[PDB]
Every structure is written in C-alpha cells, then in structure tokens.
Amino acid sequence: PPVLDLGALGQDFAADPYPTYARLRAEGPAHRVRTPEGNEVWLVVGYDRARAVLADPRFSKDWRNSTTPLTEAEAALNHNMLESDPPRHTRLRKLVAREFTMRRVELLRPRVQEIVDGLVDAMLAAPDGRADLMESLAWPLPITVISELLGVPEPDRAAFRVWTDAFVFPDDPAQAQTAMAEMSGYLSRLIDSKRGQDGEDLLSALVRTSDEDGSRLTSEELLGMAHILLVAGHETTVNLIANGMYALLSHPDQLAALRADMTLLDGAVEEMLRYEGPVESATYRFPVEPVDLDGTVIPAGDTVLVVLADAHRTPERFPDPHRFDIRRDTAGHLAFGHGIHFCIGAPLARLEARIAVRALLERCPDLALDVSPGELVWYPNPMIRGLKALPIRWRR
C-alpha cells in the first residue's frame, strides 16, 4: 500500500481529519503516511489498538531507539520524562509527582479563580460585546498559572510565548530551530537566576535538588523538566478551553442543558476531551524490535503516532461517536493518554477548564459563536487539534 500524503489534502483535512482516519481504520490498525510537514510516520488508529499501543512497552519513547536524526537544538531539550523509558522515566516523574496530585492542585483553586475572574472582567469591558475567546482567556489563563508555579517572571512571558508557538506550530523549519535554541538559552539563564535565591517556586526547588545531587537530576534533565512542564502548560489546556467552548456554542441544545443544570459541568468537560480534545495524536513512539499489528509489521525505530482523535470516534467504544453529548459515558477516553506516561497535569488542566467554562456561562449572557463554524480555521499540526481564533459575542 502506498504512503498516503496528508499534505496533499489540505486543509480540509486540518478542519475535519475524522473521515480520513475512519477510512484508514476500516482497512486496519497501522498506516504509513506523510505528514503535512513532510515526515514519514506510522498512524495507529482504532480505539482498542490505540489504547494498547499507548501502554505497550515494545513502543519506546526514548530517541536512542529511534532511527530519526535530532538536531542539536532538539536534542538539548529531550532529557525529559515524556521522552524517556523506565528507569529514567520513573526517576524523573517521581521528582514532581507530588506537585500535581488532585489534593495539591486543589490548593491552587482560589488563585485560578482569581485569574479567571480578572480575564473575564477585562473581556467584558469590550464596548461592542465581542472578543476572540482565545486571546482573551484560553491562551493567558494556562500560561499564567504555569508561569507562577514554575517561577517565570511576568516580563519574560511574552517572549516565551512567541518561541513556544514558533516551534509547536512552525510554518518555517529554520524558525522552529532558532526558537528552540533561544528557549533553551532562556531556560538555562532562568535556572541560573534561581541559584542561591531561596525561592519556593517549583523551579527553585528542582534547582536545589539538582545542585544537591546531580545524579538524581542532571543539569540537562533539569532544563528538560522546566521545558516540558512549561510547553505542556502553554499548548494543551488552551485548546481544551477553545475547542470545548466551540463544542458548546455550536451544539446550542447542549449549551442550554448545561445552563439549566450546572451540576453537569464536570461531565461536560470530559465530553469536550472525548469529542474534541486538544491532542489529535500522541507523541512519538519507536518500536524497540519489529512489531506486527494484524499482519502489518512496523520496523524497529520507525516513528509511530497513536491517533487519539480516531480512537474517540470509534463507534464500538463511543456509540453515536459524532454526537457531542455532555451526559455521555466518557470513561476510558484517551485524551490524557494511557499507561506510564498518562498526563501528569490532568488534575491541573481539569481545574482550569472547569473554572473557565463555568465563568463563561455564568457571566456571559447569551454567549454566542460570532462566526459560522465553516469560517473557523484550524491549525494544520497533526498532533494538535487547535483553532487559530474563536470569535464570540454576548449581550451587553
């Protein structure tokens, strides 16, 4: 079977990838494709097989197992738990697990509520009663929360944001490299700036751990840890909030049901993850040996992407999959992954999204989508399902 070119689609494919994936899934679990940016990878589609591959230790996350070359700017940032296997994965994650439990995250609630209250205050001063929800709330909220956790000073954040866009959503390869190089230079200086300042933010704590014992946390791993916690804080929750509010505003009967009973809110947020989560495909996996998936054999070291999005539209697992239904049974969705790499930030992402959504509904009378769905534009990245903008309006 020939390599399918996703780039050739466009677009189209970036707005609505689902039929493309579902067509693949009818033929079987694994497919050689060429991403819009030009990388040859495997797609794993279909819920059951997606779930198994996510947790299967025959599929490594360590780039030493991959046959794909890394540039210097890329390699400098890959000593992090998401790009590791046990035992390194185990050791790195244990260093921060305690910061991200539900009970520790619950203590951030007053401060997350305050950040939301202020962003919405400012949004609602708009004289025309219109805004882009992404500029006004979905982007600044997660950024502010994770910046204050890690200790990124406020004046540094705007630059920081440009980099983390420039290489999550490139448009030009040399720019992505430059940004990675700069982000890495910045994080090193930030890290150095904490030494001997007795700060109590998370990065100051990790700096002390590393300086007390460089075999528990190396300086490369310390930079990798600040990087992964910050980027994940920049680019996932944003899209959960935007995509989810889009789902609600474009399914007016679900929005009303939720208005009528706000106790449905937690279950509505799960169905946002299930129906249109920010993660369209999981991060790279590399088979340590060749892996046979129903007669399709995947060679050692090839790149494998597990397609979360298609898993979530598998009718056998989620009946009536294309329906956004806030009361659906969402248990078992893969929006936060599955297995040893299951999202460490999930309690924090849920806290943010629940608060932001409830603030929008309670505070925006007759909240409306301010363009038709057909006018929205989706970024092309096949790992991310994300809008460029979400125009909303409300009654002023």
In angstroms, the CA 138 to CA 235 distance is 10
| Nearest approach, Cβ of residue 295 and ligand HEM (Å) | 25
CA dihedral sign of residues 359, 361, 365, 371: positive
Stretch that binds ligand 1D4, among 106-114, 182-190, 200-208, 231-239 (CB under 6 A): 231-239
Task: Say if residues 308 and 324 touch (Cβ distance below 8 Å).
Answer: no
In angstroms, the CA 335 to CA 118 distance is 29
Give me the count of residues in the chain: 396
Amino acid at 243: N
Phi and psi at 86, nearest 5°, equal: -55, 145
| Residue with smaller CB distance to ligand HEM, 165 or 370 | 165
Burial label, 330 (beta-carbon count in 10 A; 0-12, 13-18, 19+): buried
177 annotated ligand-binding residue: yes
DSSP E strands, 273-335: 286-287, 291-293, 296-298, 304-306
The only residue of 121, 213, 283, 373 in contact with ligand 1D4, by rule CB under 6 A: 283
343 annotated ligand-binding residue: yes
Taking each helix axis from N to C end, the angle separating 140-150 and 109-124, rounded to the nearest 10 degrees, works out to: 140
* Rounded to 5°, angle at Cα 333 from 55 and 25: 75
Give the x/- contact pattern for ligand 1D4 in 354-383, rule: CB under 6 A. Answer: -----------------------------x
90 annotated ligand-binding residue: no
- Extract the tokens encoding 370: 């301010």
Q: Which does 383 bind (CB under 5 to 8 A by kind): ligand HEM, ligand 1D4, none?
A: ligand 1D4
The only residue of 73, 137, 298, 335 in contact with ligand HEM, by rule CB under 6 A: 335
| Nearest approach, Cβ of residue 157 and ligand 1D4 (Å) | 17
175 annotated ligand-binding residue: no
| Nearest approach, Cβ of residue 83 and ligand 1D4 (Å) | 6
* Residue 131 β-bridge partners: 392
Binding status of residue 278 toward ligand HEM by CB under 6 A: yes
| Residue with smaller CB distance to ligand HEM, 119 or 394 | 119
The residue with tokens 């589609």 is 45
Q: Which does 168 bind (CB under 5 to 8 A by kind): ligand 1D4, ligand HEM, none?
A: ligand 1D4
Binding status of residue 337 toward ligand HEM by CB under 6 A: yes
Q: Which does 229 bind (CB under 5 to 8 A by kind): ligand HEM, ligand 1D4, none?
A: ligand HEM
The residue with tokens 């090193």 is 188
Cβ contacts of residue 69 below 8 Å, gap of 6+? none
Task: Say if residues 321 and 292 touch (Cβ distance below 8 Å).
Answer: no
Task: Say if residues 365 and 124 touch (Cβ distance below 8 Å).
Answer: no
Binding status of residue 105 toward ligand HEM by CB under 6 A: no
326 annotated ligand-binding residue: no
| Residue with smaller CB distance to ligand HEM, 6 or 273 | 273
CA dihedral sign of residues 143, 145, 147, 150: negative
| Residue with smaller CB distance to ligand 1D4, 235 or 310 | 235
Amino acid at 395: R
Binding status of residue 268 toward ligand HEM by CB under 6 A: no
Phi and psi at 60, nearest 5°, equal: -75, 155
The residue with tokens 């219109």 is 130
The only residue of 344, 359, 383, 384 in contact with ligand HEM, by rule CB under 6 A: 344
Stretch that binds ligand HEM, among 9-17, 34-42, 183-191, 227-235 (CB under 6 A): 227-235
| Binding site, annotated residues for substrate | 83, 176-180, 227-235
Which residues make up the interface to ligand 1D4 (CB under 6 A)?
82-83, 168, 228, 231-232, 235-236, 279, 283, 383-384
Which residues make up the interface to ligand HEM (CB under 6 A)?
54, 81-82, 93, 100, 228-229, 232-233, 236-237, 240, 277-279, 282-283, 335-337, 341, 343-345, 348-349
